[PDB]
Enzyme design. Structure first.
Site, PDB file in Angstrom:
ATOM      1  CG  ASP B 216      -1.834   1.391   1.193  1.00  0.00           C
ATOM      2  OD1 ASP B 216      -2.449   1.669   0.371  1.00  0.00           O
ATOM      3  OD2 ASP B 216      -1.540   1.847   2.698  1.00  0.00           O
ATOM      4  CG  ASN B 224      -5.001  11.774  -4.175  1.00  0.00           C
ATOM      5  OD1 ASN B 224      -5.224  11.942  -5.346  1.00  0.00           O
ATOM      6  ND2 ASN B 224      -4.473  10.844  -3.553  1.00  0.00           N
ATOM      7  CG  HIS B 229      -8.066  14.058  -7.531  1.00  0.00           C
ATOM      8  ND1 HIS B 229      -7.946  13.883  -6.268  1.00  0.00           N
ATOM      9  CD2 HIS B 229      -9.448  14.176  -7.864  1.00  0.00           C
ATOM     10  CE1 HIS B 229      -9.096  13.786  -5.629  1.00  0.00           C
ATOM     11  NE2 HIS B 229     -10.048  14.050  -6.458  1.00  0.00           N
ATOM     12  CG  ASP B 233      -4.583  10.374 -11.313  1.00  0.00           C
ATOM     13  OD1 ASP B 233      -5.392  10.761 -12.322  1.00  0.00           O
ATOM     14  OD2 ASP B 233      -5.025   9.852 -10.136  1.00  0.00           O
ATOM     15  CD  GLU B 259      -4.442   4.177  -0.156  1.00  0.00           C
ATOM     16  OE1 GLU B 259      -5.204   4.946  -0.186  1.00  0.00           O
ATOM     17  OE2 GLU B 259      -3.469   4.046   0.781  1.00  0.00           O
TER      18      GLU B 259
END
Lengths: 341, 338
Positions: B216, B224, B229, B233, B259
C-alpha cells in the site's frame, strides 16, 4: 583467493547461470543489436555481453573483439559481478587491479572499462554488459543512466529467453557439456551437428501450432576468392559478419546453423510459402546492403539462396536436398539471388 | 486514415501475439525511457494499431491509454517499410488537422519506426514525439532504428514465453479489455483472478512455493489532499512502474484498490519472498517521484506470506493483508513477513 576473487556463494551463482542454458549457445540478433547500439551510443571501441562461467569469461555477444572468451583471472567483468554497483575504471593502467593485466599491458591495451552487472531472475549475478576502450574515460552521470538502461535491456532479454521452449529443450535434453560439440565458435552459430540435434524439436513446434517448416540453404558468393586474395583473416571477418547479417534477417524462433565451410542453413516456421521467400529475400538484401569491413578494407559480399517448404510427412533430409538443389540453381543462374521451389 | 489491402492479415498477426490490452512490461518501460533520454524528446510510445484505435503497450510523456487510429501518424507510418519522419506536423499536409497537433499535446516533431510481427506484418510503431519541430541526424535516425529493432525483437521473443503462450490459449483479446487497469497499466482484480490459478499450476509442476506481497502506498490520501488528484495519479503510474521494475517478468502483479498492489510470486522459501518485498520498498524509497516539477517523496508499506500447500488462495491473501496493516502501525515504509 585468486587474482580474480570468487563470491562466497559461487556455487549458487554458477547454478543460476547453468539453469539459463546460456553459456555455449549461438549469438542472437537482439543481443547483437544491443551491443552495436551501445557502441554507437558512447563511441567506444568494444562492447561485450560477457558471462562468468567457472574459470572463464564467455561472450554471448560482442563487438570490437575477436576473442571468444578469456580466463576469469584476466577479466574485469569477474570483479564487476562482485557488487551491485557498476564497475567504472577510468584508466586501467593506473588501477591496482588491472595495471598488471596482459589485456592492459599488451593488446588491446584496455584503459577505459565500464561494467554493469547482469542477473538471473533470482538476483544472482551471471555476468556483465560492458564498454571497453583504449583511451581513458569517465562517463558523466547521464551516460551512466543510458548504460544502466542498456544493461536492464540485456538482462530483460536473457531472462525472457529462459522462459521459452527452446531453453527448456536445451537444459532438459542437451547437457551444457554437449553444447560445446554443437557450436561453431567462429560464427557463433550452431554447426552441422547442432542443427542435427535441434531440427526435430523444431518440426515438433511447427506441428503444434499449425505452421509450415521452410528450409533456406545459402552460400556466400565467391568465398574462396576473397579468402585466397585477401588474408584468411579477412575470410574470418567475412564469415563473422555474414553470420551476423543472417541472424538479423531471421526471427528469434528460427534455427540457423553453419553447415560446410561457407554455407548456412535456416529452418524457419512460416505460415505459408511467400513468408518463406520473404525471409530468404531479406537474408540476401542484408548481405548486399553494405560492404564488409576486413581490417580497413571494405569488401562487397553477396549470398545465393535456395529455399523450399517441407511437405507434410516429408523426411527433413529430402526437404533439405530440395533447398540445396534450388541453391545450386541460384548459383548457376548468376549468384546473388534466391530460388524458391 | 488509409489502411492496407492486407489489413485482415496484419491484424491477425497482431492478435496472435496476445499483446493488445496487456500490462506494461518493465523491459519495454526501460526501453522507452532509454529512448527518451537518448534523444531528449518529451514523448516516446510503443504504439499498436488495433482495429480503429491506437493502443500503447509502453509510453512515457503521455497519459492517454489509446487514441483514435484515423488521422493518427502511426496508421500512416506502418504503410511503408521506412521510418516516417515529420519535422513539423503543423506544416505537414497530412497531419496539421490532427487534434493532437492542433490540440494538446501540440505535436510537431514525429519520428516513427514500424514494428513487425514474425511474418513481417507491421503491427505498430516505436515513435518519438515532441512539441518542438526537429529533424534527426542519420546517426540519430540509425539509433532510433536499432531501438525499434530491440522493441521488435523483445515482442517476438515475448511471444514464445510460457505466459504469453497461455494468454493465446486461454484469455482472448475480448476478455482482456476488462482485466486491465488503464491508469497503472496493470491487471486489476479481475485480471488477477483470471490468472492466479495458472500460477499455482506452475508452482506445483516445478516444486516451488507461492508468495504474496500485499502493499500500500503510504500517505496516499495526504498526497491527493496536499497536491491534488493529478499528483495522486502521477504517484500511481510511477509507483506501478517501480513495482514492475522490482519484480521479475514471470510474476503476477495487480492493482487491488485505489492505492493497493498485490504480487504473487514463485520462490524457494520465505527469505526470498521478504527479499523481493524489500526490493520493491527500497526501489520506491530510492528517489522522489516527480509531479508537475515538484518532487514528491513516496514510500510504501507491505505485508507478505507464503501460501501453505493446498491453502485456499484467499486465505494467504488475507494473511498478507493483515501483515500489511502490522507494517502500517509499526511506522510504515517497511515490510512485515508472516
Amino acid at each position: 583467493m585468486l587474482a580474480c576473487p570468487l563470491p562466497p556463494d559461487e556455487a549458487l551463482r554458477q547454478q543460476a547461470l547453468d539453469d539459463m542454458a546460456l553459456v555455449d549457445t549461438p549469438a542472437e540478433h537482439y543481443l547483437d543489436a544491443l551491443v552495436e547500439l551501445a557502441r554507437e551510443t558512447f563511441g567506444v571501441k568494444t562492447v561485450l555481453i560477457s558471462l562468468i562461467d567457472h574459470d572463464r569469461q564467455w561472450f554471448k555477444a560482442r563487438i570490437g573483439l575477436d576473442a571468444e572468451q578469456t580466463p576469469r583471472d584476466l577479466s574485469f567483468c569477474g570483479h564487476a559481478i562482485l557488487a551491485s554497483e557498476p564497475l567504472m575504471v577510468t584508466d586501467a593502467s593506473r588501477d591496482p587491479r588491472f595495471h598488471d593485466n596482459p589485456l592492459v599491458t599488451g593488446p588491446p591495451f584496455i584503459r577505459f572499462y565500464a561494467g554493469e552487472p547482469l542477473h538471473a531472475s533470482n538476483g544472482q549475478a551471471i555476468g556483465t554488459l560492458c564498454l571497453i576502450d583504449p583511451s581513458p574515460r569517465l562517463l558523466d552521470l547521464r551516460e551512466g543512466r543510458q548504460l544502466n538502461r542498456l544493461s536492464i535491456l540485456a538482462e530483460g532479454y536473457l531472462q525472457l529467453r529462459s522462459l521459452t521452449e527452446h531453453t527448456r529443450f536445451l537444459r532438459q535434453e542437451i547437457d551444457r557439456e554437449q553444447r560445446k560439440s554443437l557450436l561453431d565458435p567462429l560464427t557463433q552459430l550452431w554447426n552441422r551437428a547442432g542443427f542435427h540435434a535441434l531440427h526435430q524439436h523444431e518440426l515438433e513446434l511447427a506441428r503444434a501450432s499449425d505452421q509450415r517448416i521452410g528450409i533456406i540453404y545459402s552460400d556466400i558468393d565467391h568465398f574462396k576468392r576473397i579468402n585466397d586474395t585477401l588474408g584468411h583473416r579477412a575470410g574470418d571477418s567475412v564469415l563473422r559478419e555474414a553470420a551476423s547479417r543472417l541472424r538479423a534477417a531471421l526471427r528469434p524462433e528460427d534455427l540457423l546453423a553453419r553447415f560446410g565451410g561457407e554455407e548456412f542453413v535456416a529452418m524457419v516456421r512460416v505460415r505459408e510459402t511467400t513468408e518463406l521467400t520473404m525471409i530468404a529475400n531479406r537474408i540476401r538484401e542484408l548481405m548486399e546492403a553494405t560492404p564488409i569491413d576486413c581490417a580497413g578494407t571494405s569488401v562487397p559480399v553477396t549470398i545465393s539462396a535456395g529455399c523450399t517448404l517441407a511437405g507434410s510427412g516429408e523426411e527433413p533430409e529430402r526437404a533439405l536436398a530440395r533447398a540445396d538443389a534450388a541453391l545450386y540453381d541460384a548459383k548457376r543462374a548468376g549468384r546473388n539471388r534466391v530460388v524458391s521451389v
